[PDB]
Amino acid sequence: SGALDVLQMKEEDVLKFLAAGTHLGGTNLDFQMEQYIYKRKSDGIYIINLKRTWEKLLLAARAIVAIENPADVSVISSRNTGQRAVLKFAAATGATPIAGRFTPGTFTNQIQAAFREPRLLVVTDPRADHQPLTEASYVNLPTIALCNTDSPLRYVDIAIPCNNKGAHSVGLMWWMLAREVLRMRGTISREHPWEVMPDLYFYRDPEEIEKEE
């Protein structure tokens, strides 16, 4: 936030985070994720410090904004939980999405069909998205990740401490990232809530898709 009242945390943001359960980590704690937790609960669940989450989200948004060609940022999601969120983020901010399987050699094999050379990489989970993470170490590609308590931080340059297992949490995290990137760029404004709401970024089961119509 930079100790800026314009960039500080709002009550609506905290309420959304609590409703989505973003503060809820796992029973395991990666030693490089210690500074981002608050305390362990009596049932073993680690609580993620939401102020630190906001700080890291704003730092990631600043890193994304400082790339003039938006298509030079790649947003990855191998898991089905974050594919919809990544597609919506790419549509909103102009980034390039890789939803689904990330074929190896996409960053390293210049002969390949889907070969692309991003300037920044954002992944939904270091564990699930370990392949783009490892490939980023071959082409000088910095990485932004949504990291749970037990996520490994290797090849992750900006880790956003959050629950990345729940569909609500992942969707909301991507939604906040898109909102903050747009706000920092110049599009939209902080004087009014954003028109999009996080439920559009969420992943929904096909049974729920059928039921809700």
């Binding site: 936030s1 930079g2 100790a3 800026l4 314009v6 960039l7 490089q32 500074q35 700080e55 890291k56 730092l59 600043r62 890193a63 904004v65 400082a66 790339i67 920044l120 170490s137 071959y138 082409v139 000088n140 590609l141 910095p142 490994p152 931080l153 290797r154 090849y155 992750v156 340059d157 900006i158 880790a159 706000r183 920092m184 760029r185 110049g186 902080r190």
Partner: protein, 82 residues
């Protein structure tokens, strides 16, 4: 860098990791140079300025690039104190 006559004789001056102050080699393809955008004090928008941080491949490999970039941003006013 220099000789007795005073001119600079190196081919180039390689960068140093902003966290470890070690030379980043010519073939350190895991090293990154990340620019973090500066934000205008009153409106919170990108003002065209940024602060650069070069992190070597070793630091990224040991998982310490995240904490090092956090430390640099905190010492640079980007990340709020406390």
């Amino acid at each position: 860098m220099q000789n007795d006559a005073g001119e600079f004789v190196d081919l180039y001056v390689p960068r140093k990791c902003s966290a470890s102050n070690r030379i980043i080699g010519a073939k350190d393809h895991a090293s990154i140079q990340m620019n973090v955008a500066e934000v205008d004090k009153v409106t919170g928008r990108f003002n065209g300025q940024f602060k650069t941080y070069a992190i070597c491949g070793a630091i990224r490999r040991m998982g310490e690039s995240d904490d090092s970039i956090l430390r640099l941003a905190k010492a640079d006013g980007i990340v709020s104190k406390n």
